[PDB]
Every structure is written in C-alpha cells, then in structure tokens.
C-alpha cells in the first residue's frame, strides 16, 4: 500500500572505479592459458578492490586447495596494492598482518590499477611455487591495457 | 627485486556510485535519533549496493539480536531495491527467497537510490515491530537529498 | 629422508566425467551475454557434480546477493539433476529438502549431463525472477553440445 | 494463556559501565576526520568491553580488509586494556595469544576506560601502518573526556 | 615507549544491569535439579541481555542438540523479553522472525528482568517437549528474587 | 618443571555406552551394500549419541549434497531417538524444531539403541527419496544385534 | 505407520567414562571462587574427553575473549591429557600443532583423569597470565577426588 | 510443464580418476587396525583429490581433536602429493603455506596415486606423534595395489 524510496544526490555521492566483468574474465582466462601452456594446473581469481570476487576459474587437474588460495591472494594483493610475493616479506617486521581475515600472504597475487589506485587483484594458485603462480597472474594482468 | 603493476584503461573499466561515509553516517544517525525520540532502542545499519556494510550503530538498550538483523535488512533492501516490508510479502509465491544467504525478509529495511539505481540500504531493528523499524529507516533516508 | 607414495590400480579405481574449464567458461559467458543483451545484471556459476565450483562470473551492476545464490542454484541443480524451478515445487510434499546444506530451491539453476548422468549445474541469479534467471542458464547450457 | 516473568533483585544483580552510542559515534567520527585530513582511507570500529561492536564506519576508498581488522583491533584492545601496538610485542614471549579467537595483535587499537576499567576499544585500519592507524584511534579517544 | 589511555566521563557514559554469575549459576542449577527430579535429561543456558552466554550446563544423558538449543532459546527470550513459547506463536503473522540470526522460536526459554527490563534469558532443552523445558526454566527463574 | 593432573572418582563419575567403531563401520558398510545392490548411489553416516560422527562413507556417484545430509540425519535420529521420517511429521505442530542447529528433519536417519537408550544414529542420503534412504539405514542397523 | 529401532549388544558396544555434570560444575565453581578471592575476573570451562563442553561460567568483569579461550584451553588439555602450559612448549619442535582446529596452546587448561585416562579438561582465561589461569584451573580440579 | 536438460560431449568433457569407496574404506580400516594393534587410538580420513572426504573413522578412545586433524592431513597430502611430514618442513622457507584454508602441515597424511597423479590422501591423527600417525597411514596405503 506504501512507497516510495529516497534519491540521494550532490556531495552525498561519490564514484568508484572497477574492471568490467569482461576485462576481469579476459585477464583470468589469460592466466589459465599461460599456465596450461607450461603444463601447470591452477585456479585463478579476480577480486575487486571492494572485496567482491568477480571471476573464478578452476583449472582442470588443479589441487583442491588452489581455488580458495587464489581468491585470498587476489584479495590480499588488491587490499595493499602490491604483489603477495612482496607482502609476504613484510611479515618479518609485521608478522601479525597474516592474522587479518581473508588474507593469504603468499606469492601468486598481483594488483591491477586505474588512475594509480587499485581496482582489482588477480590471484593464482596450483603451480609448484607461488612465484610461478604470480608469473601467470602477471600474464593475466598483461592483456589489460595498454 | 621486482615490479611493477599493470594499469587498466578504456572500456576495460566502468564506474559505480555510492553514498559517502558522511552521508551514510548522517542517515544512520537520523534513524537512531527518531527512535530515541519515541523511546525506542534500535540498531541501525547502512549497506552498500556492493554488499559491504558502511555504517552500523548499536543503540543503548537495544536487543542483542538487533545489530545483525539491521545489517541483513539493509542488505536485503539494497539487493532488490525495495522495502523489506514489501519483499516479505513475495514469500507467499516465492517462499524460497528467504533461503538466499545474507537476507532477512522482515520490515525494517529500505533502499536509497542514485539515478534510479540502488546504492544503499538502510536497516533498522529493535522496535516492537518491523514496520516501526522501517519508519525510522525512512527518517534516516529522509535527511538525504532533496 | 624418507619416501615414497603408494600407487593404486585395478578395481580399486574408477573414473568420473566432468566439463572442461573451457566448456564451463563458455557456458557461463553465454549466460551473461544473454542477460546483458536483455539488459539484465546477473551473477553466473557452474558447479561440478562433485560439489566444486568451476566458474563464477559477477555481472556488472549485479545485486550483492546474486553471486552466492547462483552458486547454490547450480549446486542444487546438479545434485538432483533437475531445474531448480522444478525442485522448488517438491517442497510442497518434501518441504525439508531446503534444509539440506548448500542448497537454494529457487529457479535459476539447470543441470548439464554426460551419458545421462549429471556432470555440472549452471546457476544464474539477479534477474527480476528465477524463471528468467533460468532462461539465461539454459542459454548457457545451449552452447554446449550438440 | 500463561505468564509472567521473574524479577531479580538485591545481590543477584550488578551493574556495568559503557560508552553511550553518541560518545562512541563521536569518537569513531573523530578518527575518520583525522585520517581524512591526512589523506588516509580507513575503517573505524568501537567495541564494548562486553565484546559487542557499537559503531563501525567504512571510509571512502578504504581497503576491503580494513573493516574487520578495525573491529578485531578494538576487541583486542578492550580485552587486555592496552594498545594493540603494545600487545603485539607480548607475542615474543607469549606467541599463542594471537590464537585467541576474535583478536588481531596489530597496531591500530587503543582502549578507553571508566573508573580505571576498560569500557571500550577504538580500532582503526587502512593506513600504511598500524602505528598510524593507532594515531587516529587516539584522536578518536581524545574527543572523549576530559 | 608510549602511553597512555583516555578516560571517558559524564554523559559519555551509561550503566547497564545484569545478573551476577552466582545468581545465573544458581538459576541454571535449579533448572537441572527440577529436570533431574522428574527424570529428564536437559541442557541449560543463561544468556545476558547483551547477548553473551553467562552459564551453560549439559545434563547427563542430554541429547547432543540440547546444548546449543538452550543457548539460542535463552538468547531469544531475553531479546524480546518474552517466553519462547509465546514468541513461537508470532510466527503465524510474522514468520520471518525465525530468520533472525541466533534465534530459536521454540518453547524452553523464559526471560528474567530487573526494573522492568530484561537482563537475562534462561533456556532449557532436552525434555520431550519445549513446554516442559520451559517449566524447568521457570523453576530456574523462580529461585531468583523474591 | 611442574605436574601433575588430578584423578576423579566415586560419584563424581558416570559411564556412557556407545557402538564400537567396528560395529558402526559394519553397519554403515551394510547400508552402502544394500544401496549399491539396488543401483543407488548414497552417502552414509553413523553419529554417536554424544554428537560425534563416528563413520562416514561417500558412495561412488553419490550427489555432493548427500554427505552432509546423511550426517545431519543421523544426528537428528539419535537426538530424538526416532526415525527422521517420523520426526519430519512433528513439524506440523512443532515447525520450529527444524531451526535446531545440526538437524535435518528428512527421512533417511534411524536410531540404534543400547538398554533402551539411543547410542547412535545411522543416516543415509542420495536415493530418489528419504524413505528409500531410510530402508538402507535400517539394513545398516539390521546387521547389528541380534 | 512404521517402526521400530534396532538394539545393539555384546562386543558391538563399549563404555566410556565421564565427570558428572555435578562434579564438573563443582570444579568450575571452585576455579571462579579461587579467582574471585584473588580479585581476578575469569571465564571457566569444563570440556569432556569426547569434545563436548559440559560447563561454562563467565565471571563478572571478565574479558570478552576469556569465554572462548577457556573453552579451547579445556579442549586442548583433555585432547593431549596435559596442561596447556606444557603443550605450549612442544610448539618449538612441533609448531603446527596449534593449527589443529579447536585448540589454544596457552596456559590455563589442565586435564582430569579417571583410571589413568583423560575424561575432562578444565580451562580458565582472564587473569593477567595463563600460568595464573592454570593455578585456578588446578584449584578447580583439586575439589575433585581424593 | 517444461524440460529438458542439455547433454555435453566431445572435447567439452574430460575424465578424472578416483579410489573406489571400497578401496578407500579398505585403506582406512587398515590404518585403524595397525594402530589398534600397537594400542593406539586414532581417527582416520581418506580425502579425494577433488577435495571431498570419502571415508572417516573415529577410533575408540581417540582424542576429540583427531577427527578433523586426520581430515585436514589427508586434504593436505593429496593437494601437494606429498607426506605431510615433508610438507611441514617447507614452512621454513614458505611459512605462509599453513595459511591456506583446509590444511594442516603436520605429519600423519600421505598421498595415494594413479598414473603418477594424486587421487587420494590418507590422514591419521591421535598417536603420540604425527610420524607415528603417518606410519599407520602408510599401512593404510599399503593394502592398495600392488
């Protein structure tokens, strides 16, 4: 019987920037392809700066741990706007950073920016090492731009 | 030893709209004030269209269930861009909607829009009824604009 | 200092069948495209018969509830090898089916088979109704085969 | 048909002390303002000594990890009545303290007292370091009193 | 190297009222004793108005479901300041109340007050029916006062 | 440097009764065999009266929902010492029983007793119906005794 | 229409030993009393060897972290049949023990035995140190026997 | 009124390999028997390479922590195709591996292969040490083949 909703405006509003789903998909697929080429089996995830996972892809033959790991890696990379390889080394002086929920301070995640600000993280997991995971995440990032 | 991150651009990017924290705070505080005036004790929550909770306020004397309820109500209102009072009545023909995670199909949540699109939900819980919760949520929405 | 692992064989082993990640991706992308064409904003998920999510895609402008909903819908469809639209109607005589963990008995999920057995479920959420979600899930399934 | 509830009294009862929602809000808003001034993007949380979160504010541009981190920091500070910067250093001799649920032994949380007893913790997260988070949490505490 | 914490005062503070642990224990033990006398095997819980569980007792021979049930019942009773037997009947007109987290709208929980305000809920579970659970919860409440 | 632990005795102690792991395994395997014979694919679970799961078996080709369902069914059957087929029908007059954590009021679970008291529940899930699940659970129970 | 349940017997059954609820309560209350005497504010928990929590008591003024900590400490002590003070020191050579779910390798938990086998753990948390927590847990254990 | 589902084929499909439930059961039972012989009380788990737990067995007298530990150990062993004893030692150079969800880098888990690829992990927990747990897991693996 009743209605209707309020419309905000002016300085009550601000805008944020994101990858399109199409771009995030393009990036994630590029990571898998690079891994599949090298005979690796990986899961890939793209997480928005807002915390939401935009894309996930579970590779054929990938380990059952790789899916969530890739997700947490992307989340970690976009949160601090840095490769998870780098972030893992801050734990020497700031070891309780890993106690932050949703994070995995392990190589395989790398950020993507727009106007110098992080908009997404691309996470990979499943390769024999996180550094190799990250190589594929970079390959994922590299189709974006340029 | 290594760096650096990729910059996306062009049609790989899109923008989204949100309430400012200041506006969301202003709205949430307005809901409490309206409840406090009528002698009610409530929790209030503002949830962004992206799913993230932007503001929560636990009223003095509020029930221990009101906090999470207000959060889920705001989440529900912004998800379907409608008052939770209305959404609760769709359950007659679509009863499994309540089985959607994060939702609470109970009066007390109302949406806020920008350019005809939902950007936030304002949720309230603690009053003797959800319809009264919603009155205060509307009072919260009403300071935005106009 | 020590090793190594045991190798099973013979009737101790059996094989299972799955969609490739490439096929699951192709299907999920087809669902989004069909929704985007009709101006809808949806999340899509492909879940393997083994319970594992293989692909997720969060549409631009999709509701924050759509992601997990699509996942649970695909899981539900592949578990019972039936559209979630159909499964929702069994609740009249079997109402406690919805109490099964991981399920969402709501239109939007449809199964994919191999040799008459379910191998994947395709789930969609975000459209004004689950029946419309399911139309797009069918469009997703339809690029597979034929 | 039936009623009614029992009323306790005398030495069966005791009283506890808390910040008002208005005071907790005032403090949390003061932390954001101090961060916003220095160009930082942070989430802020005020947690009661009873464990309940009273206020949360998610700053514009804040990292998606900052919200829960600020909450756990405030919880940690009020639990031990000490800055989380200090508490993080006890881990050298008591490293399993971090294994306590709900805690984050990382700078950014500081306690607030009443009659020499902790009543609230103020947590901040999002700045380049926890020590800087804590500076803003102190600014939040500083509007209370004096 | 650094310190120290802020002290709040005046109208920045408010007081709340609670059962003592001794009183809550006395009540919970009285419920068990009444059940044990009638040959029943039950779990008992006392939950504070702030949401925190103060006391739990798992009866010998009690069902493995009774512990958490008693907890949720006490939480539900103190949240709405009413017997869970009564609250269960509001579901006819307000069926989505049960969707509130932490609740169990089933007989066995009854509130305890101080100055006309709820301070605790006493929950019982394990007897052949919730109405019988509630009888024992009332016996628990009855040693308080009078 | 320090020790040692206290030894309780007398009326401070009581004994409880359980199925052996060997018996629970024998029963669970008998359920699978009966299902496999009829061409059904099911998961089976044996849960102790204390709430602990003693045995689980995931059938080949079983649905991904069957594992947890069988567990919750066994838990439900041993909690109320009755078939879940029967317990599902109490929901007409006691519909909030399903809101008890850990439960699934759906046919497929049946209790096992010792000295007239429940000691275990045997749960099955995966067949086209819960009544058929329960037939196999009974076959599981039937190898015990007699 | 149908019934009835199977009765196991013989070597299909085994018996286990436990503290009575009365004994567990007596012990937990003794721990609080010893802490209250020394002016400490603590939560206490008694956990059965089967994993189930039998008793919890939240002290007046206790920290909001103490409740769950005491529970995990009791669980840890009864799992390994040793003081958590001792168990914390095994982490030097076996550091991944803390990664076991439900555990907290921190002083405050001590086991109780029957016939040389663990039957319960008594956990305490809230004092300025775990060693002091454990002193009170020992006082709790000491009223049992002798 | 509507139907029916799509059938995938060709290169849209791939096959995976698994232990049969019968083989997994045979292995798990062999581990228990070897432990029971040496007077040890353990829980055993077999987890598929896809992440799903196929078999669990809770030994008589086993610690309440052993069940989940064995599960996580099997999951960890099959994820990296290596004994958890070995994997625990990678933490020296890759310490954040333990932060991967679902894992427990502690001796007691060993992999089983088919065609040089991991298909299952066998996990054991409860013995005085993980190395001894692993001995029994190997005994479990050893009945498979040869």
Residue numbers in the entry:
A (entry chain A), B (entry chain A), C (entry chain A), D (entry chain A), E (entry chain A), F (entry chain A), ...: 11 to 156
Which of the paper's sentences describe this entry?
Our previous reported works have characterized HbpS as the accessory and sensory component of the two-component system SenS-SenR that together mediate a genetic response of Streptomyces against iron- and haem-based oxidative stress. Moreover, studies have shown that HbpS is a novel type of haem-binding protein that degrades haem in vitro and in vivo. In this work, we have shown that this multifunctional extracellular octameric protein binds ferrous iron through D/EXXE signatures. With this sequestration function HbpS complexes ferrous iron from the surrounding environment and oxidizes it to its ferric from, making them inaccessible to react with hydrogen peroxide via the Fenton reaction, the products of which are highly reactive and are damaging to a number of different macromolecules.
To address this point and taking into account that the E78XXE81 motif shows the strongest iron binding, E78D, E81D as well as E78D/E81D mutants were generated. One could expect that the exchange of E to D would not have any significance relevance for iron- binding behaviour, but analyses of isolated mutant proteins incubated with ferrous iron revealed that all three mutants show strong decreased iron-binding activity, namely E78D up to 40.7%, E81D 32% and E78D/E81D 34.9%. In order to gain structural insight into the effects of the E78D and E81D mutations on the iron binding of HbpS, the HbpS-D78XXD81 mutant protein was purified and crystallized. In the wild-type protein, the glutamates (Glu-78 and Glu-81) point towards the central cavity of the octamer and are apposed by the corresponding residues from a second monomer, thus creating a cluster of four negatively charged residues. In the wild-type protein, the distance between the Glu-81 residues from two apposing subunits is 6.7 Å, whereas the distance of the corresponding aspartate residues in the mutant protein is 8.6 Å. Furthermore, in the mutant protein, Asp-81 is engaged in a hydrogen bond with Thr-63, which can be expected to further decrease the ability of this side chain to take part in metal coordination. Moreover, comparative analyses using the high resolution (1.99 Å) crystal structure of HbpS-E78D/E81D and of the wild-type HbpS revealed that the proper orientation and proximity of the side chains of the glutamates from neighbouring E78XXE81 motifs within the octamer are also essential for iron binding. In HbpS-E78D/E81D, the side chains of the aspartates are shortened by one CH2 group, and it can be assumed that this weakens the coordination of an iron. In fact, the iron-binding activity of this mutant is considerably weaker than that from the wild-type. The overall octameric assembly of HbpS-D78XXD81 remains unchanged and no major structural rearrangements were detected.
